[PDB]
Design a protein around this nucleic acid. Structure first.
Ligand SMILES: Nc1ncnc2c1ncn2[C@@H]1O[C@H](COP(=O)(O)OP(=O)(O)OP(=O)(O)O)[C@@H](O)[C@H]1O
Ligand SMILES: [Mg+2]
Length: 971
DNA sequence: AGAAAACCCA
DNA sequence: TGGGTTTTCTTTTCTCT
RNA sequence: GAGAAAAG
C-alpha cells in the first residue's frame, strides 16, 4: 500500500519524538519541504508527529510554523492536530485560553470535540493539557461519564458473573509487604534484561592455564568494550552528519538506548555465541529485537509508567494478599479495572526493513569492531591483531576463530545467562485484562502463541464483543496466579546423578564422558551418539540451573494460549508440562490440609504414577497402595541406596516425589490435618473419544470411554491390544516370523498412539511411524524387523472398522468434509468456542494467501476437540475458583490439592454436562452457516456447504447426566 | 529406503 | 489421464552445518 | 536445515 520510504520516515519521526531530538526532525522536515520530490509522499501523520512533539516542548513559534506548513500541499488538520494545537494554546495563556481562533475554527471544521476526546488515541498528559485549555474558557464542557464495565451474560458464564452468590475466592499465603518486595525484585530483574545463573556442573579448581585464560578474556573483553564505544560514537557522528545533510538516518535508533547498554548487548551476544557461528540475518534480527525490547523497557522508566504500575500493583495486591481485605470480593481483572487502569501507551514495532537495517548496522559494527591477538598460546610471540570474526560471505555464518572458542573452553566460565522473559516471574503476573496487557510487567506478552508473524489471530481477538474473552482471560490469570516452589530433595538427588555420571534410565543425561569410543561407520556412529548425548546434557544443564536458581524462591508461571485454546506457561525450560524430572521438581507453594479424604487420593495418585493397576477400580488401587507401603517408605527414605522400587515405575521421579509426600503424610500425627503441597492429578480416559461420544450421544462409546457409570474403568487401548494379540497368535500358528518375534510385545503402549489417532484424520504411514518409534525404544525387541513389524502393526488394527466408534466417525467425517469445502471455497476455517473465544487456523501454504486444504482438513477435528476440552478446562477452572480451589492443567490433566480432588471431580462432571447440554454441533452449524454461507458470488458452493453443515449427524441415545455419576470419567 | 495412495497442478 | 509430495494436531528444549 | 529428545 504505502511506500517503504513513507513507513521508514514515519518510524524516523516517531523515534525522534521518543528520544528528545526534535530539532533533528524539524531539520529533516524543512529539508524535505524544500524539495518538490521530497515534499511529496509525506502523509499527514508525520507533520502530526512533529505537531505533538513541539506540543510536548511547548515551543509556540515552531509549532505555529509546522501548523502553517500543514495547510500547504493539501493537508487539512486532523482531530489530533487540533488536539496538539489546544495543548500548546493551553500550555501558554494564548488566545484568552484558545478560543480566539482555535475553537472557532474547531467548530467551523465540523470535527466533533467529543470524537477528539474519545475516538482518537491521545497521551494522557496531553489529554489533561487539552482539558486545561478547554477549561480555561468554556467550563460547561465536561467529559462524558464512563459507564460501569459490562458483565458477561452467556449461559455457561452466567454463574461465574452472577453478583448474588456464595463465593469463596482463594487468597495467597504471602502477605502484602512480601508481595510488594517480590514485585520490586521482578521489576529490577526485568529492567536488567538478562539474568546470570550458576552452573550446576562440577567446578574446576584454580589451575595455571585456566586462570591465565580467565585473565586473558577479561583484558580482551575490556579492549573490545572500548573498541565498541569508539565505533558506535564514530557511527553516531557519521549518522548525525546524514541527518544534518537531509538524508534518512538511523541516528535516533542508536540514541534509543544509551552507549553502555548497546555495548553490553553486543558483548552478551559474543558470550552467548556457540562454537559454530550463527546465520548473519538471524544475528541481525536477534540484535534488533533486543534493541526493541530494551527500548520498551527504557521508555516506561523514563516516561513515568513504571511508577504508575508500582502504585496500581501495590493497590491490586490487596485482593491476593493474605493480610488484606477488599471491600467486595471479585475477580482480578475486575479488581484491576475497578481501580484506575493505567493507559497502555503501546509501543509498536517498527517497519521490518528498518529493523533489518538496525540489525545489519549493529552486526557490522560487531564484525569490524572486535580484534584479538593471534598468538594466544604464546603471549610473548608477536602476532598481528587478527580479526576474530570475518566470515560474512560463507547460509552466511560468521566465523569464531578457534583460539577464542578454545580460550572459552579452557576458561571454565561457571555462569549461564537467561532472558528476563525466559525465567519464571518472582511476583504474581499482571492480570489478563486485554489481549494486549497481561503476564509480564514490562514486556508485551501475546495472548496466542504464533510463528512467522501471523497476525490474524489478534485481529480476531480485538474484533469481538468486549465481554467475550472474559472467561478465557480470567482462566489464564487463574493459571498464572498459581504459586510454585521447587522440591529440593528431588533436586538434590538429580544433581547428585548429574554431577556424577548420568543415569539415562532415570532421565538424567550422560556426560561427554562415558561416550562410545568398517572403521568409518563405527566412528561416525560414535560421533553421532556423542553429539546427541552432549545436546541432551546441555538441555538438562539449563533446566537444572534455573531449578537451582529458584530453589529458595516462590515463583509464578504466566500462561498464554495457543490459537485453538489450550494454555501453556511462558517460561520454557522449567515448567510443569515438561518431563518427569521437571514435574517432580515443581510443587505447590500454597498447601491445603488433607482432610478425611486426601490421603486416599495421594495413594491413588502414587499407584497411578507407577503405571501398574490401570485396569483396576479405585478400591483396588488403594488396596495395592496398602500392599506396597513398605516399598514406598523405603523409596522415600533410601532412593539411591535402597531396593530402588521407585525406579521401576513408569514415571520414577514423580513416583519418588509422591512416595516422599505419602511418607510424610502417613507418619504425621494427624494425617487429616497435614498440609500437602503435592499436585494430585486427574486425567480423562480418551478425551477425543470422550468429546466425540458426548457430541454424538453414542451409548456404546460413552460406556466405552467411561461417560456411563461402571464399577471398573474401561480402556479402548487394552481392548484393541487384546483384539490384535488374538490375530498375532492366529498368524503365528501359520508360521509367520513377524508374528513369532512379537510375542510379549503387543502392549497398550505400542498401539496407544494409533488408536488415539484413529478418531483424527490419520493415514497408515503416520501410524506406522507411531508404532515404529515405540519399537525402536524396545530394547528386548530385536531391531532387525522393526520396519516390517510396524507394517504388521498397522495391519490387523482394522478392528476399529467393525462398527467401532461409529458416531465418532460420522462426526469426524462431517468436520473433515466441512473443512475441505470451506477451504475449497477459498476461506480459512474459523469458529467461536462455546466460551466465546474465536479460533482461526494459520496454515496458509501458498508460499500465504490461499488456505492449504490438506492441512486445514487434517487439522480441523483435532483443533476442534482441543477447543472443546480447553473450554471444559476453563469452565472447570472458573467454577473451582468460585469454590476456592487451586487448579492447574496439563491439557486434560487437571491438577489440584488432594483435599480438592472430589470437588474438582464434581465441577468436571458438571461443566462437562453444562458444556455438552448446549447444542455444540448445532451452534457450530448455525455459526458456520451464518459466517461462511452468506456470500452472493458462491451461492452454489454455499449450497453444497449448507447441505453439509445442516446435515450434522443425529445425536444418539445417552443421557449425559449419567456423567455426574461416572466414577472413571476423570481418574 | 522400501511396501503407496490421495490430492493438486499440468 | 500423468507426475510430485505428505503422511493427525499442538507445544517445548539443546548442540552441529 | 538436519541430528536428537520431551509434553498432551
Ligand atoms: N498425538 C496426539 N494427536 C492428537 N491429539 C492428541 C495426541 N496426544 C494427545 N492428544 C489429545 O490430548 C488428549 C488426550 O491426552 P492423553 O495423552 O491423556 O490421551 P488419552 O486418550 O486420554 O489416554 P490415557 O488412556 O493415557 O488417559 C485429547 O484431547 C487428545 O485429542
Ligand atoms: Mg490420559
Amino acid at each position: 500500500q504505502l511506500s517503504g520510504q513513507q513507513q521508514r520516515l514515519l518510524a524516523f519521526f516517531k523515534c525522534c519524538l521518543l528520544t528528545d531530538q526534535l530539532p533533528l526532525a524539524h531539520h529533516l522536515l524543512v529539508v524535505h519541504h524544500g524539495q518538490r520530490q521530497k515534499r511529496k509522499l509525506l502523509t499527514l501523520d508525520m507533520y502530526n508527529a512533529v505537531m505533538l512533539g513541539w506540543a510536548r516542548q511547548g515551543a509556540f513559534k515552531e509549532l505555529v510554523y509546522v501548523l502553517f506548513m500543514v495547510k500547504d500541499a493539501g493537508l487539512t488538520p486532523d482531530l489530533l492536530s487540533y488536539a496538539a494545537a489546544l495543548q500548546c494554546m493551553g500550555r501558554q495563556d494564548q488566545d484568552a485560553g484558545t478560543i480566539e481562533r482555535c475553537l472557532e475554527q474547531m467548530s467551523q471544521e465540523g470535527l466533533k470535540l467529543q470524537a477528539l476526546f474519545t475516538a482518537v488515541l491521545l497521551s494522557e498528559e496531553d489529554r489533561a493539557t487539552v482539558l486545561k485549555a478547554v477549561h480555561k474558557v468554556k467550563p460547561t464542557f465536561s467529559l462524558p461519564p464512563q459507564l460501569p464495565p459490562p458483565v458477561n451474560t452467556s449461559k455457561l458464564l452466567r454463574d461465574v458473573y452472577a453478583k448474588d452468590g456464595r463465593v469463596s475466592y482463594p487468597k495467597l499465603h504471602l502477605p502484602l509487604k512480601t508481595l510488594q518486595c517480590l514485585f520490586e525484585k521482578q521489576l529490577h530483574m526485568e529492567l536488567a534484561s538478562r539474568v546470570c545463573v550458576v552452573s550446576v556442573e562440577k567446578p574446576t579448581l584454580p589451575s595455571k592455564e585456566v586462570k591465565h585464560a580467565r585473565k586473558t578474556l577479561k583484558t580482551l573483553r575490556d579492549q573490545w568494550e572500548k573498541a565498541l564505544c569508539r565505533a558506535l560514537r564514530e557511527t553516531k557522528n557519521r549518522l548525525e552528519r546524514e541527518v544534518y545533510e537531509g538524508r534518512f538516518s538511523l541516528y535516533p535508533f542508536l540514541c534509543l538506548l544509551d552507549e553502555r547498554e548497546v555495548v553490553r548487548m553486543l558483548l552478551q551476544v559474543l558470550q552467548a555465541l556457540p562454537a559454530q557461528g550463527e546465520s548473519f540475518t538471524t544475528l541481525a534480527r536477534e540484535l534488533s529485537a533486543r534493541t526493541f525490547s530494551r527500548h520498551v523497557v527504557q521508555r516506561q522508566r523514563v516516561s513515568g509508567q513504571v511508577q504508575a504500575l508500582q502504585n496500581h500493583y501495590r493497590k491490586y495486591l490487596c485482593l491476593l494478599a493474605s493480610d488484606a481485605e477488599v471491600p467486595e470480593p471479585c475477580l482480578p481483572r475486575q479488581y484491576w479495572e475497578e481501580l484506575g487502569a493505567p493507559e497502555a501507551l503501546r509501543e509498536q514495532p517498527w517497519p521490518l526493513p528498518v529493523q533489518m537495517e538496525l540489525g545489519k548496522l549493529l552486526a557490522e559494527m560487531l564484525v569490524q569492531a572486535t580484534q584479538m591477538p593471534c598468538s594466544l598460546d604464546k603471549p610473548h610471540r608477536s602476532s598481528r591483531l587478527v580479526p576474530v570474526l570475518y566470515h560474512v560471505y560463507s547460509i552466511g555464518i560468521l566465523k569464531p576463530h578457534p583460539a577464542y572458542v578454545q580460550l572459552l573452553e579452557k576458561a571454565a566460565e561457571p555462569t549461564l545467562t537467561f532472558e528476563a522473559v525466559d525465567v519464571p516471574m518472582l511476583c504474581p503476573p499482571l492480570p489478563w485484562t486485554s489481549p494486549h496487557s497481561g503476564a509480564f510487567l514490562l514486556s508485551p506478552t501475546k495472548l496466542m502463541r504464533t510463528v512467522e508473524g501471523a497476525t490474524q489471530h489478534q485481529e480476531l481477538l480485538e474484533t469481538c464483543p468486549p465481554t467475550a474473552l472474559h472467561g478465557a482471560l480470567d482462566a489464564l490469570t487463574q493459571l498464572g496466579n498459581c504459586a510454585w516452589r521447587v522440591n529440593g530433595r528431588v533436586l538434590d538427588l538429580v544433581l547428585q546423578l548429574f554431577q556424577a555420571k548420568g543415569c539415562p534410565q532415570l532421565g538424567v543425561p550422560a556426560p561427554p564422558s562415558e561416550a562410545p569410543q568398517e572403521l568409518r561407520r563405527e566412528l561416525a556412529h560414535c560421533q553421532k551418539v556423542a553429539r546427541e548425548m552432549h545436546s541432551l546434557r546441555a538441555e538438562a544443564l539449563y533446566r537444572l540451573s534455573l531449578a537451582q536458581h529458584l530453589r529458595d524462591r516462590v515463583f509464578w508461571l504466566p500462561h498464554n494460549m495457543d490459537f485453538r485454546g489450550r494454555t501453556y506457561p511462558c517460561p520454557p525450560h522449567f515448567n510443569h508440562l515438561g518431563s518427569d524430572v521437571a514435574r517432580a521438581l515443581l510443587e505447590f507453594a500454597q498447601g491445603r490440609p488433607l482432610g478425611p479424604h486426601g490421603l486416599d487420593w495421594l495413594k491413588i495418585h502414587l499407584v497411578n504414577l507407577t503405571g501398574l493397576k490401570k485396569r483396576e477400580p479405585l478400591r483396588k488401587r488403594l488396596a495395592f497402595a496398602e500392599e506396597v507401603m513398605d516399598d514406598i517408605l523405603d523409596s522415600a527414605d533410601q532412593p539411591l541406596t535402597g531396593r530402588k522400587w521407585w525406579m521401576g515405575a513408569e514415571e520414577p521421579w514423580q513416583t519418588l516425589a509422591c512416595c516422599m509426600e505419602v511418607a510424610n503424610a502417613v507418619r504425621a500425627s494427624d494425617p487429616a490435618a497435614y498440609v500437602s503441597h503435592l499436585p494430585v492429578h486427574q486425567d480423562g480416559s480418551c478425551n477425543g473419544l470422550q468429546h466425540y461420544a458426548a457430541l454424538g450421544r453414542d451409548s456404546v462409546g460413552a460406556a466405552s470411554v467411561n461417560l456411563e457409570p461402571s464399577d471398573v474403568p474401561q480402556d479402548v487401548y487394552s481392548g484393541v491390544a487384546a483384539q490384535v494379540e488374538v490375530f498375532r497368535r492366529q498368524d503365528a500358528q501359520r508360521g509367520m516370523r513377524v508374528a513369532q518375534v512379537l510375542e510379549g510385545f503387543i502392549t497398550r503402549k505400542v498401539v496407544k498412539q494409533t488408536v488415539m489417532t484413529v478418531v483424527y484424520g490419520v493415514t497408515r504411514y503416520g501410524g506406522r511411524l507411531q508404532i515404529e518409534k515405540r519399537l525402536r525404544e524396545l530394547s528386548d525387541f530385536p531391531q532387525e524387523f522393526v520396519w516390517e513389524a510396524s507394517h504388521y502393526l498397522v495391519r490387523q488394527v482394522f478392528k476399529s472398522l467393525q462398527e467401532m466408534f461409529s458416531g465418532t466417525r460420522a462426526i469426524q467425517h462431517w468436520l473433515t468434509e466441512s473443512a475441505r469445502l470451506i477451504s475449497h471455497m477459498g476461506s480459512v476455517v474459523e469458529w467461536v468456542t462455546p466460551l466465546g473465544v474465536p479460533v482461526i487456523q494459520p496454515y496458509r501454504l501458498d508460499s500465504s494467501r490461499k488456505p492449504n486444504t490438506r492441512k486445514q482438513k487434517n487439522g480441523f477435528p483435532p483443533n476442534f476437540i482441543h477447543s472443546l476440552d480447553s473450554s471444559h478446562m476453563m469452565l472447570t477452572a472458573l467454577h473451582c475458583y468460585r469454590k476456592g480451589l487451586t487448579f492447574v492443567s496439563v491439557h486434560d490433566c487437571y491438577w489440584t490439592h488432594a483435599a480438592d480432588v472430589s470437588v474438582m471431580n464434581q465441577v468436571c462432571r458438571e461443566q462437562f454436562v453444562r458444556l455438552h447440554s448446549e447444542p455444540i454441533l448445532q451452534d457450530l452449524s448455525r455459526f458456520l452457516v451464518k459466517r461462511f454461507c452468506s456470500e452472493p458470488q458462491k451461492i452454489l458452493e454455499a449450497s453444497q456447504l449448507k447441505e453439509t453443515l445442516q446435515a450434522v449427524p443425529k445425536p444418539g441415545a445417552f443421557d449425559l447426566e449419567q456423567v455426574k455419576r461416572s466414577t472413571y470419567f476423570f481418574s
